Design a binder for this molecule. Structure first.
Ligand SMILES: *[C@@H]1O[C@H](CO[C@@H]2O[C@@H](C)[C@@H](O)[C@@H](O)[C@@H]2O)[C@@H](O[C@@H]2O[C@H](CO)[C@@H](O)[C@H](O)[C@H]2NC(C)=O)[C@H](O)[C@H]1NC(C)=O
Lengths: 96, 48, 96
């Protein structure tokens, strides 16, 4: 949506809502863990024991950009951009 | 013979895992924590 | 006798020091030795309880023998580190 701040599509927003990803982000500062000891956070416990999770190279925004490019290509060009150079075609004729 | 006369446009979802969490282990941290004696014993034990 | 699981009133001839907090130290509480950072705790120990353990059986809290304050114990080491190099043959300069 050009207006909304998400930068992803509506269905993608719903899908990202459906799945519970536990902790958001891959950064957990030492001060954060020490200041919230009372809440026995699982991530703090596993980080204090040498187990770390590394962020994916492609961010969710980058993956959404790839998906948007794929959708736009199939809408404007269709199948022709998978073989050579994307060739424009009206969507109704692609449907035909 | 049976011949269809009408049709529907169906949209179905296929959910496919693509990747899992990338993880790494500080072997010394997990096995020994912050103990120096345990670290030396782990060195002597062998680096798997 | 029992050693490191309950309050004690018989102790070896050792000299106590001042309580240092928010600094990585080598600590010895009633004979239990270790390395960690000590912080004030919100836990409420019963009179018959001296130590507290987390799900990993790591001693994560302790009642100060002198002030009766409850202190949380945290590991000193924490945080992922990675090294970026262009190749030792090319250069000895790295990013971290
Ligand atoms: C244990 O004793 C300490 C120290 O108080 C006394 O005076 C010292 C100079 C020394 O002679 C000790 O052996 C004595 O017990 C008590 O510590 C209190 O708490 C604060 C915080 O660290 C300390 O600085 C103060 O000196 C003490 N406060 C007082 C005396 O009002 C501590 O409370 C005693 N604990 C028990 C369980 O009796």
């Amino acid at each position: 949506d050009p207006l909304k701040p998400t930068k992803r599509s509506f269905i993608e927003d719903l899908l990202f809502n459906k799945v519970t990803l536990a902790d958001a982000g891959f950064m957990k500062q030492y001060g954060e863990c020490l200041g919230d000891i009372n809440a026995r956070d699982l991530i703090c416990a596993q980080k204090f024991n040498g187990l770390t999770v590394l962020p994916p190279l492609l961010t969710d925004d980058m993956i959404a950009a790839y998906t948007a490019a794929l959708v736009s290509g199939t809408a404007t060009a269709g199948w022709t951009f998978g073989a050579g150079a994307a060739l424009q075609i009206p969507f109704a004729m692609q449907m035909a | 013979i049976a011949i269809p006369t009408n049709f529907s446009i169906s949209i179905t979802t296929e959910v496919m895992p693509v990747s899992m969490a990338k993880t790494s282990v500080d072997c010394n941290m997990y096995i020994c924590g912050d103990s120096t004696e345990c670290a030396n014993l782990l060195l002597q034990y062998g680096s798997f | 006798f029992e050693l490191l699981n309950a309050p004690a009133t018989v102790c070896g001839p050792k000299l106590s020091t001042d309580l240092i907090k928010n600094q990585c130290v080598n600590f010895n509480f009633n004979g239990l030795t270790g390395t960690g950072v000590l912080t004030p705790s919100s836990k409420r120990f019963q009179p018959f309880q001296q130590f507290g353990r987390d799900v990993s059986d790591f001693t994560d809290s302790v009642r100060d023998p002198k002030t009766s304050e409850i202190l949380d114990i945290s590991p000193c080491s924490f945080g992922g580190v990675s090294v970026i190099t262009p190749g030792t043959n090319t250069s000895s300069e790295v990013a971290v």
